[PDB]
Structures are given as structure tokens and as C-alpha cells.
Symmetry: C2
Subunit: 328 residues, 2 copies
């Protein structure tokens, strides 16, 4: 399991649910015994590692091939830098590995390398926005070839999911924007999801394939998963944004700020409200999983459903373990 530098909780409340989550239990069982779908993961309870774990999810899953992912990201990094300042590289590679290993833990060694390379590309572009060509184009084309030869079915959507993200990040969103309802912000915040890549990443790491029509029954669960992911990211990232907001005059589009204004409460209470919102979202995920279990669902369809749960849990762990959010 990848060493953890830090652990923190913005709200530091934590809770226990009144009902036993028979669903989500596969994560707990995976700590001690082999569970279907998690054969490529180390599954643990973050509380044993001293990480604050304010979630109904009993465990977190991490790909056991993170060391291969570190090498691949390091490899890609060297290609780019050929085509203080060392500080960003240490963080970029660390973040490029920690995110996919936790968010998409079912990755075997080769698919972990692809995921780590994909994360580095996404993260390098994200950092640039928050601030020869044929040669660079050749680097990505090689990355595309390695991906398409690993997974020919999902590979194109995987790479297309990356490119779709680049298109959306261009889109300016006015500083004059104000949100009247919290749902209204949710519909907006869900948009910064990069779902097409994330959905393809689940397909890739779980080594399954779903047509878009196969995804239609999972629409409700899919929206809950995007909501939990985005809102979780806002909660843990809020303090880091406030630091950046005072320094560079950067805006905060965080749900904390939205909640503070809409409900007219203190910042600390808004964070508590956001954490509580997430706890109910986790319950809604659990109910939807139960409802879906009643319906006739394909094994691959159910594996995708469970993968979304693994993204949410891994996102919480990643965010709690992330230094950029923790003590900025």
C-alpha cells in the first residue's frame, strides 16, 4: 500500500449509520478475504491507519500496482521535460499516482500505468489553466497506441474522454455567475466532473465493457456518484481555494461558499452542512444500489455500479491523504 504523508478532516465530526449497509459490505469483507472485482486491490479501513474516515463506506480500496504507476508517470514526465522548480514535479507525480490508484483501484499493473500516465496529462493541463508541436503530438500518439493495444474496446473512449475534458476546460464561466438554489449549483458543479474519462476509467480498470444503452438504467446512481465526488472534492479543497483566493484574488466556486450564502450561516457551519449533505448522499447511493439489485442487471452492469462506489470511497481517501488540501 502506498505510504501516506498526511491525513485530515475539514469538518472532523464523523458518524455511524442507523442501518447496516448490507451493500457496501463487500468493501469490508475485502479487507480479510478475496472479493470478486477487488482481486487487484489492497482494501483497508483508513481508521486503522489513523486517517479520519467520516463516511458510511466501511473500507477503501487501492490498486496494488501503484509502484508500476509511479514508474510510468515518472517515465512520461521525463519524455515531456525533454520535449523550487523541482518542487512541482515531486507533487505532480505524487498526485498523478495517488488519484487513479485510489479512485480506480481495480487496475492491474499495465492498466495502472495507463491510468497514471492519463492522470499526469490531465493534471499537467489543469495546473497550466490555473496560471516541436509534432514532437509533443508524437508523445500523446504513443500514449494512445499503448492504451489502444492494452484495451482495444475501451481505449478509444478512454482517450476521447481525456480530449473531451480539454474541450470543457476551455469554456469560460463568468465571474458574474451566482447560484439561486443548491441543486442549481449541483447541476453546474456536476459539469466540471470529467465523467466521460471517469466512466471509461472504470470500464478500463474493471476490464468490462458497457454500451451507452447499458448505462441508461444506472443513470440515477451515476448522478449520485458524480454529486458525491464533486461535493467531496469541494469540501476537502475549500481551505486550499481560500488560500489561493486571498493570494491571487482567485474565485471560490466551492459548495461551502454557496451553502454559506444560501443558508446564511458561518463558514464552519456550511462545511458541517456539506459533510452532512454527503452522508445523506451516501445513503441515497446505498438505497439505489438496493433498488438496482432488485431489477434484472447484467454482471458487467453491476460491476460498473460497484466501481462507482469504489470511486467515491477512494476519492474520500485520496482527498483526506492529499497534502495540497491538508495544511496548505
Amino acid at each position: 500500500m502506498r505510504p501516506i504523508t498526511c491525513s485530515f478532516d475539514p469538518v472532523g465530526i464523523s458518524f455511524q449509520t442507523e442501518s447496516k449497509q448490507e451493500n457496501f459490505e463487500f468493501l469490508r469483507e475485502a479487507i480479510s478475504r478475496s472479493v470478486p472485482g477487488l482481486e487487484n486491490c489492497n482494501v483497508f479501513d483508513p481508521r486503522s491507519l489513523g486517517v479520519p474516515w467520516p463516511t458510511s463506506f466501511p473500507a477503501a480500496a487501492q490498486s496494488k500496482y501503484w509502484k508500476d504507476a509511479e514508474e510510468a508517470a515518472a517515465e512520461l514526465m521525463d519524455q515531456i521535460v525533454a520535449a523550487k522548480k523541482a518542487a512541482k514535479r515531486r507533487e505532480l507525480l505524487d498526485t498523478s499516482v495517488s488519484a487513479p490508484m485510489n479512485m480506480f483501484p481495480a487496475a492491474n499493473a499495465p492498466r495502472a500505468r495507463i491510468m497514471a500516465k492519463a492522470a499526469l496529462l490531465i493534471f499537467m493541463h489543469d495546473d497550466v489553466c490555473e496560471y516541436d508541436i509534432l514532437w509533443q503530438n508524437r508523445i500523446f500518439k504513443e500514449f494512445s497506441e499503448e492504451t489502444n493495444r492494452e484495451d482495444p474496446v475501451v481505449g478509444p473512449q478512454f482517450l476521447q474522454g481525456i480530449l473531451n475534458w480539454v474541450e470543457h476546460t476551455r469554456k469560460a464561466l463568468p465571474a458574474s455567475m451566482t447560484f439561486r438554489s443548491f441543486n442549481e449549483y449541483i447541476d453546474y458543479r456536476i459539469g466540471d466532473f470529467a465523467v466521460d474519462f471517469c466512466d471509461a476509467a472504470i470500464l478500463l480498470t474493471c476490464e468490462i465493457f458497457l454500451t451507452p444503452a447499458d448505462m441508461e438504467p444506472l443513470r440515477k446512481l451515476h448522478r449520485l456518484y458524480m454529486t458525491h465526488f464533486s461535493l467531496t472534492n469541494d469540501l476537502y479543497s475549500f481551505n486550499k481555494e481560500v488560500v489561493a483566493e486571498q493570494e491571487t484574488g482567485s474565485a471560490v466556486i466551492n459548495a461551502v461558499r454557496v451553502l454559506e450564502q444560501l443558508v446564511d450561516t458561518s463558514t464552519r457551519s456550511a462545511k458541517v452542512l456539506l459533510r452532512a449533505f454527503l452522508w445523506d448522499l451516501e445513503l441515497q447511493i446505498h438505497d439505489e444500489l438496493t433498488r438496482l439489485k432488485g431489477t434484472d442487471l447484467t454482471p458487467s452492469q453491476w460491476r460498473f455500479a460497484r466501481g462507482m462506489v469504489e470511486v467515491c470511497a477512494g476519492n474520500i481517501f485520496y482527498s483526506a491523504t492529499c497534502l495540497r488540501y491538508a495544511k496548505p
Copy 2:
């Protein structure tokens, strides 16, 4: 017509004709009257603008939309230097416009635009010899190209990429076969197709291949003669290697440098005669209108290459 920076001839001897050269004369025709295929170019005589013109080709053609190509190349450069001394960029912009406008003169305003951007990409790569951002620039260029010409354009972009991948002599014919090889053939053939607004399948190309090889030889050897002085000056300056037909011939014939330069110039004139002879032979053969348009385009690339080489400041002594 694009302003001229310099004009030079490495050798200095002029061509004299014992033969009419009727198949070339469409180049004459185009100076005074409209010639089919040359509606998008200004056709002129380099000698009149004081440019040494040591060729049997009577005229050279340059696209009338070079100012648009000047614009497009400038835009692309700005995007590139935004994604992450100054003399190189100005030189790169110059050659990126001068070469394709002369080599591929039939280009209209949009097609001149594609060529200048394509030339800039190639030339910046040769000089060298956030990732997702740079990739997006090439992506828009590909879509911009395919959207002008959906049939020729995928080959035109594939020819660029094929060029990117591909990066003492005992026999001169052996040296020629090598230099033919270092020829960005895929791109150049596609650029002729694009600028001439015609398409030829590979089977359509079967008849013109002997001329195509003559054209490749004339292009390579012409570039070698003009480049030579820069290669030799570099060799004294930085001990850099000289791979040039001039040096090869000087070695094989064991002769002086001007004799080698004169020898190659005469060889080039004989290639132009062979080009002219093949044109007549093909005229008897059954050729499609654009099949014939491709043949004339290759001559236009050859003539334009001489003009470009004579007009290039780098090829001229610094």
C-alpha cells in the same frame, strides 16, 4: 508578389537552348496570358527581378495568396509560443511562407493558409532536429485541413507525420537513391493534390512515376547545390558533416569545387531535358485531365524550388 530579400546563384553559368522546350512553354504563356491551372499564381521570370535564373524552365510561378499565408503562419506561431534569439522565429516565418508559396503556387487563399501552417510545423520540427494543449493545436489544424479538402487532406496530414518518423559515397547513382529517400514524398504529392484541387489514387499515379522520380531527383539535387555553401561554411565553423552531391562528385571525379558545382548544374539541366522529354512521351499516352494536372504540378514544384533556393537568405552566404 512577395518581396525579395536576396538573389544568388552558387555556380553562375546560364543555360543556353539548342531545343525549343515546347512542353515547358506553358510557363511562358502564363506570364502574358491566363494558363489553365495557373489562375491562382503570378507567373514571372526571375531574371527580370534581377534573380539569377540558371534553368531551362522559362518561368517560375508563385501563389497570389502569399499574404494570407503570411497571416496564417503568424497565427500558428503565436499559439505555439503560448503553450510552452528572436531571429529564428522571423527566419522560420519567412521560410514557412517562401517555400510552399513558390513550390506549390496553385494554392487559393484557404489552401495557401493550410500550406503555410503545414510548412511552419515541418520547419520548426527540422530546426529542433501542456502536452494536451499543443496536441489541440495540431487537432484544429487537422480539422481545418480536412474541412477544406476531405479527400486529399487525410493523406496531407498523414504525409506530415510520415516525415516526422523517417528522421563517403562510392556511387553517384547510390547517392541519388539515398537522396530520393530523404524526400518528404507523401507530403509533397499530397500538397500538389491539395493546391491543384485534384485527387489521384495510387493507381492513378502509376503512369507519372518515371517523371515523379525525375522530379524528386531535380528537387533534391537543386536543394543540395544551393545548400552546399551553408554546409561547407558550417563545416569550417563547427566541423559539421557535409552530405552533398557537390562533395560526392568532387570526390568521385577528383576535381575542384567549382568544377563540381558546374558539373552538378549541368547534371540538373540534363534532368530538366529528361523531364521535358517525358512530358512529350506522356502526351501521346492516354492521361486524365487531373493526371495531367499532377504532371504539370511537379514541374511547377521543381521550378519553384529553384526560385525558393535562389531567394533563400540562409542558402545564400549569410
